[PDB]
């Protein structure tokens, strides 16, 4: 059985699953954060993709579809049909909750770009069926990359939470086949998430549970999960103490247990590389981080 | 000790190495080109990576720096001071040459996006002395990414040439510690591109000499390059036929003999088979 | 994520002839490889027959090649086992199996798949 691996880079030199974007920090969510459900930087350890995660970041967080002034009618982002009433959407699309959206839409063939706005929140959001308001996007075919993001413009004065998803259904119908929920199994453990600055009005932290280059690592891999979660440490290149114990679940996600938000994962330096230990119990016991 | 592995991924899920861009087909360069140098997407065998090519996508054909109105002051992609008279540019620099650049600017911290409309040309684009001409960006800190490209503003009426890289340098100095140019080795064979569709006013393709994917493989496995040249094959997915055999040279580009390697499918994986001589003839394609 | 919805079975006599149908949804985008295996009481799983979703090729075991045949709906996102001169040795629970990681071929190992049905049963009596 080819044995289970994790790339030999620093956390410095990769990438957000769920935006285009260099990872800045490790961290942990806030308190009222127990769970979460990702749609894009989702793989198992064997590299099977969940949700809407591509292979590569040249498809994470882009659209691509044909305005008609009121609708953009949504295709996969090489043209290909999508078909309604299958998934949440169209791979690579945006699952950042709790924020407006700001596109960068670009057209082959075509000079120039344009700014598309996103309120994830009114029933005409709905790409689960294949198709988002244009709010004032001309007609034409378009393919777009988030670019920024701002306060949702619905709740009225809520704030930006990006351990959120959209609403990808609407009062017609809820959207199906979403990639499932993870939460940190074991004794004192919470979930481990790689974190990036956006671009926007604020300080905005954009957290994945994976690195993109993790992903296309394990997918070409495809490592038989032949335990129940993966021990790891966190090395330090310049000595190579072990910074820290996590597990790795077959799910595709991190724990650890963090001794604390202002003493642990979250001040961990970022020029660090996780390397596979051993196979272990799903309730193996970490010693804390900090 | 390590062997020498390719990601067992298919060409269509991968990503151009000079653009954030979906790969769409494989490409052979016109006859009318020599050479190129590519200074992003360029990785050896073992590992290494040339010019300004970073590991990850995340970083590739964006800049960084501070505008005073006049100029942008680069520096690396994460704020890191960028000195003159060392490199082409940092790290990730969009290297396509030929065009005229429009470059999506945001700001941390700040909302909005600005359209950056970047001539390669003039005597103020000086990448290598670390900054370029602001053409109208206000004051203040950016991160920028390559959107679209058109024609070059200069010479008047060029038409796009993906085949270049920009003018780093400066009539005083010429740029330092390029990434070396790339040449056909000879016996028939031609260079292997991988190409992407750019927007833009035009039907423009963009060729890169490895996926971003491969790039970030090898740096990882860093597996020794125990030999001339790695022969590969383009493996159907469908029937597992062999689809054509091809070499990769330690340098980090892939060549065949070529109706011909344009033609082929692009959901195809490259299976690495043995070390060879350079000088190993391959059956055309 | 993928889902995997047989139906079709039932009892049948020797000589007769059943067809399965496998309703796949959710992801479907990149599967690969679409494929049904068979347990009978006290015998492990075994392959029966596998397609390239989306491509051309497909293989059949042995005990079955000149019988039994998969395919894809042309309209639906479907894959169909005909099973033709039945035999009370094809009795057992049929289950259909998807594969979207990345791979060559047709693939028989049953660790190999990604996604299973529920299984339905077919029952060939004489």
């Known amino acids: 059985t080819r044995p289970f691996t994790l790339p030999n880079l620093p956390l410095s030199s990769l990438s957000n699953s769920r935006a285009p974007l260099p990872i800045s920090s490790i961290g942990i969510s806030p308190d009222n954060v127990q769970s979460v459900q990702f749609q894009n930087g989702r793989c198992t350890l064997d590299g099977r993709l969940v949700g809407t995660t591509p292979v590569s970041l040249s498809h994470v967080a882009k659209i691509r579809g044909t305005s008609n002034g009121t609708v953009i009618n949504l295709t996969e982002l090489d043209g290909t049909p999508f078909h309604p009433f299958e998934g949440p959407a169209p791979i690579g699309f945006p699952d950042l909750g709790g924020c407006d959206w700001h596109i960068n839409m670009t057209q082959f063939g075509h000079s120039s770009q344009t700014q598309y706005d996103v309120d994830t929140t009114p029933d005409t959001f709905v790409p689960h069926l294949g198709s988002i308001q244009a709010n004032g996007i001309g007609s034409g075919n378009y393919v777009g990359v988030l670019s920024w993001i701002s306060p949702p413009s619905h709740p009225s004065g809520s704030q930006v939470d990006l351990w959120k998803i959209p609403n990808y259904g609407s009062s017609i119908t809820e959207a199906t086949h979403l990639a499932p929920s993870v939460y940190p199994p074991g004794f004192g453990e919470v979930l481990v998430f790689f974190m990036s600055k956006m671009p926007g009005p604020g300080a905005y932290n954009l957290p994945c549970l994976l690195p993109q280059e993790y992903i296309s690592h394990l997918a070409s891999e495809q490592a038989p999960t032949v335990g129940e979660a993966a021990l790891l440490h966190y090395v330090d290149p310049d000595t190579g103490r072990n910074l820290g114990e996590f597990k790795a679940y077959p799910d595709g996600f991190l724990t650890c247990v963090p001794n604390g938000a202002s003493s642990g994962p979250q001040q961990l330096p970022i020029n660090g590389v996780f390397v596979f230990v051993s196979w272990v119990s799903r309730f193996y016991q970490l010693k804390p981080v900090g | 000790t390590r062997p020498f592995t390719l990601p067992n991924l298919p060409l269509s899920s991968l990503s151009n190495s000079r653009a954030p861009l979906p790969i769409s087909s494989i490409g052979i360069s016109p006859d009318n080109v020599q050479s190129v140098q590519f200074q992003n997407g360029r990785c050896t065998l073992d590992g290494r990576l040339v010019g300004t090519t970073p590991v990850s996508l995340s970083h590739v054909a964006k800049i960084r720096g501070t505008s005073n109105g006049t100029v942008i002051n680069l520096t690396e992609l994460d704020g890191t001071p960028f000195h003159p008279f060392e490199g082409p540019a940092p790290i990730g620099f969009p290297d396509l040459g030929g065009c005229d650049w429009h470059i999506n600017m945001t700001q941390f911290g700040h909302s909005s996006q600005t359209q950056y409309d970047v001539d390669t040309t003039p005597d103020t684009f000086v990448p290598h002395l670390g900054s370029i001409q602001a053409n109208g960006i206000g004051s203040g800190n950016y991160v920028g990414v390559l959107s679209w490209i058109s024609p070059p503003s200069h010479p008047s009426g060029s038409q796009v040439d993906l085949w270049k890289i920009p003018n780093y340098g400066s009539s005083i100095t010429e740029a330092t510690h390029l990434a070396p140019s790339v040449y056909p080795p000879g016996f028939g064979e031609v260079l292997v591109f991988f190409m992407s569709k750019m927007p833009g006013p035009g039907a423009y393709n963009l060729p890169c000499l490895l996926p971003q994917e491969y790039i970030s493989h090898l740096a990882s496995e860093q597996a020794p390059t125990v030999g001339e040249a790695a022969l590969l094959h383009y493996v159907d997915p469908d029937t597992g036929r062999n689809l054509g055999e091809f070499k990769a040279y330690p340098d980090g580009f892939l060549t065949c003999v070529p109706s011909g390697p344009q033609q082929l499918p692009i959901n195809g994986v490259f299976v690495f088979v043995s070390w060879v001589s350079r000088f190993y003839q391959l059956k055309p394609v | 994520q993928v889902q995997l919805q047989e139906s079709g079975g039932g009892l049948v006599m020797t000589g007769g002839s059943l067809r399965l149908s496998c309703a796949v949804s959710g992801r479907t985008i990149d599967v690969s490889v679409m494929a049904w295996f068979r347990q009978a009481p006290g015998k492990e799983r075994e392959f029966v027959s596998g397609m390239r979703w989306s491509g051309m090729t497909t293989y059949s075991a042995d005990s079955v090649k000149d019988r039994f045949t998969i395919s894809r709906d042309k309209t639906k996102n479907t894959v169909y086992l005909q099973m033709n001169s039945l035999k009370p040795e094809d009795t057992a629970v049929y289950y259909c199996?998807?594969?979207?990681?990345?791979?060559?071929?047709?693939?028989?190992?049953?660790?190999?798949?990604?996604?299973w049905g529920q299984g339905t049963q077919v029952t060939v009596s004489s």
């Open positions: 199996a998807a594969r979207s990681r990345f791979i060559v071929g047709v693939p028989q190992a049953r660790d190999l798949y990604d996604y």
